[PDB]
Design an enzyme around this catalytic site. Structure first.
Site, PDB file in Angstrom:
ATOM      1  N   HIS A 190      63.795 -90.357  27.911  1.00 47.19           N
ATOM      2  CA  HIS A 190      64.117 -89.317  28.663  1.00 47.19           C
ATOM      3  C   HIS A 190      64.252 -88.082  27.973  1.00 47.19           C
ATOM      4  CE1 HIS A 190      65.831 -92.833  31.155  1.00 47.19           C
ATOM      5  NE2 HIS A 190      64.547 -92.530  31.636  1.00 47.19           N
ATOM      6  N   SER A 249      65.663 -97.630  30.768  1.00 43.85           N
ATOM      7  CA  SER A 249      67.105 -97.977  31.088  1.00 43.85           C
ATOM      8  C   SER A 249      67.504 -99.243  31.307  1.00 43.85           C
ATOM      9  CB  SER A 249      67.533 -97.116  32.357  1.00 43.85           C
ATOM     10  OG  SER A 249      67.505 -95.728  32.085  1.00 43.85           O
ATOM     11  N   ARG A 268      55.932 -93.760  30.285  1.00 43.29           N
ATOM     12  CA  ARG A 268      56.150 -94.738  29.118  1.00 43.29           C
ATOM     13  C   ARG A 268      55.251 -96.050  29.554  1.00 43.29           C
ATOM     14  NH1 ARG A 268      58.904 -98.857  31.644  1.00 43.29           N
ATOM     15  NH2 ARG A 268      60.162 -98.379  33.237  1.00 43.29           N
ATOM     16  N   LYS A 315      73.679 -98.522  46.446  1.00 40.19           N
ATOM     17  CA  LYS A 315      73.580 -99.347  45.059  1.00 40.19           C
ATOM     18  C   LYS A 315      74.348 -98.879  43.959  1.00 40.19           C
TER      19      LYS A 315
HETATM   20  C1  LIG Z   1      60.274 -91.483  30.196  1.00 44.16           C
HETATM   21  C2  LIG Z   1      60.818 -91.058  31.612  1.00 44.16           C
HETATM   22  C3  LIG Z   1      61.068 -92.164  32.653  1.00 44.16           C
HETATM   23  N1  LIG Z   1      61.733 -91.297  33.759  1.00 44.16           N
HETATM   24  C4  LIG Z   1      61.977 -91.946  34.957  1.00 44.16           C
HETATM   25  C5  LIG Z   1      63.390 -91.780  34.921  1.00 44.16           C
HETATM   26  C6  LIG Z   1      64.400 -92.744  35.634  1.00 44.16           C
HETATM   27  O1  LIG Z   1      63.914 -93.260  36.672  1.00 44.16           O
HETATM   28  O2  LIG Z   1      65.568 -92.979  35.211  1.00 44.16           O
HETATM   29  C7  LIG Z   1      61.656 -90.333  33.407  1.00 44.16           C
HETATM   30  C8  LIG Z   1      62.166 -89.165  34.137  1.00 44.16           C
HETATM   31  C9  LIG Z   1      62.105 -87.886  33.702  1.00 44.16           C
HETATM   32  C10 LIG Z   1      61.656 -87.461  32.386  1.00 44.16           C
HETATM   33  C11 LIG Z   1      61.142 -88.638  31.558  1.00 44.16           C
HETATM   34  C12 LIG Z   1      61.272 -89.883  32.199  1.00 44.16           C
END
Ligand SMILES: Cc1cn(CCC(=O)O)c2ccccc12
Ligand SMILES: Cc1cn(CCC(=O)O)c2ccccc12
Ligand SMILES: Cc1cn(CCC(=O)O)c2ccccc12
Ligand SMILES: Cc1cn(CCC(=O)O)c2ccccc12
Ligand SMILES: Cc1cn(CCC(=O)O)c2ccccc12
Ligand SMILES: Cc1cn(CCC(=O)O)c2ccccc12
Lengths: 157, 153, 155, 155, 157, 153
Positions: free
Chosen positions: E17, E127, E90, E41
C-alpha cells in the site's frame, strides 16, 4: 537418481533463469539445462556463447550440466533417462501456451512438467525484453549475470 | 431455421475442431464450416479432410471463405458464429472480435470448450510435433493423420 | 535425498489429486501428503488419511500425515523445503502464486506446480460432493474406495 | 506541476485512445502523446500526429510529439516520470505489466493504467483497419476526421 | 489542483500500500487515503488504529492526508472535489472485479480509476495474507511498516 | 426442435441478462430461463420481473429450478445451456462446471458475452450501488428498477 531438464533458448540467460536453475539443482539430484536451438533462425548469441554464459554463472552448482539440442524436447529428456521438465514462470509468460505444451508433452512421451515462479526481483526480465532495452541504451545490468552483460553490450556495438 | 457458422483455418482439422462441429450440428438446424484463407494443406485439401470427417453430420456443410467473416455469415442468411475454446486459445482476442462482429453486423458469437481429451491439440502444435516424429494419431481424424504423414514423408 | 510435500484438504481425495501424487512420487525420493485441517468438512481427518492411503497403496515413498498451522513449518520440520501443488480448471492460480512467493519469502520453501491430466482437470473435492449430493455420477473422477464412502455419507 | 506521457503507435488514433487522452488531460497538468515509430504502418508519423491534434483540439494541456528509442528516455527528457496507458479488450495486460515493472526499474518511471469506456473497448487500430479494408463500418469507433482519412488510404 | 483518492480497508496497511501511496503523492498535487469501513463487520484494527498506522508511515509525504469513510467510494471522492481513484495491483488482485467496479464508478459518477502495479518486492503481501501468516507465527516483518508489525503481534497475542 | 436453458439466480434480472436472453431466443427455437434457488427478491418475484421484461420473446419461458442444473435441462428434453459473460465473471469456474456438466449428462454449454454497455452490471453490484443511492436505472429493465427502489425504501 532423480533429475529434471530446464529448457529454453537462453539467448541470453538471465537472472530469472538462474534463479530457477538454482531451485531445480536444490530439489533434484541432477539438472540438465537444455539450450534448444532452431537451426532455421539464429539468435543474438551462438550456441557456444549461450552455453559458456550459463556455465560461468552456474559454476557453484555441482549437479547441473548444460547441453544443447533441437527437435522435440521430450526426446532430449527421455534420451537422458529422465522424465521431468522444470520451467520457470515470470511476468509475461504465456502460461496457457506452457500448459498446452505440458499436456501435449505428457500425452506423447509421459514426461511431467513442473512450473516454478521466479523470484519477484527477477520476475520482469526476459531475454527478449533485456535485449530490447539494452539495444536502446537502458540499464539491465542488475537483471543479468556478469557472464552476460558486457558480452551483450559487445554484440550491440 | 436456426444455424451457425464454425470458422477457422483448419490446417488440418483436429478432433478438437470435430468435437465442436458435432456439438454445433446437434444444437443448430444448419451448420457451415467456414475455411478461411501459406499453410500446409491447400483450401481444397482442408475442405476434403473436413467433409471426410463429418460424413455422419447430415446438416453440416463445408465452404471456403474470404473477406469479413460476418459477411460470410450474413450472406448465408445466418447471424451466429460457434467458436471452440482450447488450452492456448487467445480468449481475450476472441472476445474483442466477438464484440466487434456484433457491432458491425449484429452477429452473435457462442463459445464452447472442446472436450478435455482434445483440449491441448491445435493444428499448429499437431504439425510441429508430427514434424519431429511425435505420435499425434490419437488427436486427429484417422483420415487426416494419414494425410499429414504423407505431406511430411 | 530429495522430497516434497503435497498439501490440501482432500475432502475427499480425487483422481486429480492422485495423478499429482503419482507424479510427485515418481520425481522425488520422498513425498508427504499433508492433510490440512481448519476450524468443518464432510470427512474427518482420519477418514481422509485413510482414503488417501487406500488410493496410494502402490507408492512406497509417499506417506500421509495430518497437519495444522503454518504449511512451511510443516515442510521444514520434516527436513524438506519443496511443495508440489496441482493445477486444475478452476484453480485460483493468482492466489497460488501469491502464496508461493510468500512461502519462499518467509521460509525459503519452493513451490512446484503440475497440471493434472485433462481427464481429471474438471473434478474438485467441492464440485464432486455437490454433484453427488444431487445424484450425479462422479464415479469416473474418484478412486473406487472413495466413491463407495461418499455414497455412504450421503445416504 | 504534474504530467504524464501517453505512448503508442496510433495508426490511426481511435476513440478508445481519445477517451484515455481525455482522462489523462483531466487529471494531469500536462500530457504528451508520444507517437512511437518502428522500422511500417498505414499512416506516416506526421499524418498520425495530425489526426491526434484534430481529435484533441479541446485539450489545451495535451500536446503531440513523435518519439524514437527508449520510452523512459522520452519521458524523463521532458521532465516527467509517469506513463498513462489505456486498457481495452485484447490488451496483452501481462506484457504491459512486465514493461511497467521494467520501466520503473530502469528509470524510476511510474505507469498508470486506465480502462477505456465499454463503448470503445473492442476497437483497436489494427482491427479497425482490418474491418475497414473489407468494407465494414467502423465510423462509430473512430474520430470523424480519422474515418474520412482511412477511407482515402483504402480507396 | 490535481488530486486522487487511494481507497481500501487497510487492515492493516502494508508496504505494498505504502509504495502506491508514495507513487500517487509523487504524481498528484494532493492524495487522500480513504479508509473505507463496513459498519457491519469489524476488522482486526479499529478505524483510529488504521489511520494512525498509515499516518506514522506517511509522515514524509506532505501532500497526503488520511480520512475514513463508508458507503459509495465515488461520493467520498466527489464530495472532496476530486474525480480520480488510484488503486494498486498485486499478485492475487481480482483484477476483473476491479475493472467491473471501475467501469461502474465511471458510469454512475464520472470518476476515473488509475491502476498502478506495486513494486515486485511488495507484490505478494496483502493485509489478509499477512494477518494469516502472522497468526501462525510466520515472519512478515519485512512486508509491513514499523508502525504496524508489533501492533499486529499485539492483536494476535 | 432446438432449445437452450439460461440459468442464474437473477436477483434481480439485469439488462445484461436480458441481452443474453434475447440472443438465445433469436438463435434457438425454445428458451427456458431457469431461476435457481437468501437474496433480495423471492423466487416468484424474480420470475415475475423476468416475464415482464421478456414479454416480447414468444419462444421464451421462465421457471424456477432446484437440484442439478443438468437435470433441469434434460427433464425438459434439452441438452444445451446458454450462459452470459460479463466483466467479473469467474470464467475458469464456468469452464469447470461446463466440463463437469458435459461429463455427467452430455449437456453442452455455450458462452456469449453481453453487450459492452451492460458488461459491468451484475445483480450484486446493482443492489450494492442502489443501496447507497447510486443511479442504476440505465442498467436494469424499467420495471425492475422501480421494484428495487421499493424494496429499499
Ligand atoms: C496494493 C494495493 C491494494 N489495495 C487495496 C487496498 C485494500 O483493500 O486494503 C490498494 C489500495 C490503494 C493503493 C494500493 C493498493
Ligand atoms: C523464467 C524462465 C523462463 N524460461 C523460458 C526459457 C527460454 O525460453 O529462454 C525458463 C526456462 C527454464 C527455467 C526458468 C525459465
Ligand atoms: C477448438 C477450436 C479452435 N478453433 C479456432 C481455430 C482457428 O481459429 O483457426 C475453432 C473454430 C471452430 C470450432 C472449433 C475450434
Ligand atoms: C489437483 C490438486 C488440487 N490441490 C489442492 C486441493 C485441495 O486443497 O484439497 C492439490 C494439492 C496437491 C496436489 C494436487 C492438487
Ligand atoms: C486504449 C489504448 C491502447 N493503447 C496502446 C495502443 C497503441 O500502441 O497504439 C493506448 C495508449 C495510450 C492511451 C490509451 C491506449
Ligand atoms: C450476463 C449473465 C451472467 N449470468 C450468470 C448469472 C448467475 O449465474 O447468477 C448469466 C446467466 C444467463 C444469461 C446471462 C448471464
Amino acid at each position: 537418481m532423480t533429475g529434471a531438464v530446464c529448457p529454453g533458448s537462453f539467448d541470453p540467460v538471465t537472472l530469472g533463469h538462474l534463479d530457477v536453475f538454482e531451485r531445480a539443482a536444490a530439489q533434484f539430484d541432477e539438472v540438465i539445462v537444455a539450450v534448444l536451438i532452431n537451426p532455421n533462425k539464429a539468435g543474438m548469441f551462438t550456441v557456444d556463447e549461450r552455453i559458456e554464459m550459463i556455465r560461468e554463472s552456474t559454476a557453484d552448482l555441482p549437479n547441473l550440466r548444460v547441453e544443447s539440442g533441437q527437435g522435440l524436447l521430450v526426446d532430449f529428456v527421455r534420451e537422458r533417462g529422465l522424465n521431468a521438465i522444470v520451467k520457470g514462470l515470470r511476468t509475461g509468460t504465456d502460461f496457457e501456451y506452457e500448459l498446452q505444451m505440458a499436456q501435449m508433452n505428457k500425452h506423447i512421451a509421459g514426461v511431467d512438467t513442473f512450473f516454478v515462479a521466479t523470484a519477484p526481483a527477477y520476475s520482469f526480465v526476459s531475454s527478449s525484453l533485456a535485449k530490447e532495452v539494452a539495444t536502446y541504451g537502458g540499464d539491465v545490468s542488475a537483471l543479468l549475470p556478469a557472464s552476460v552483460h558486457q558480452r551483450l553490450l559487445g554484440k550491440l556495438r
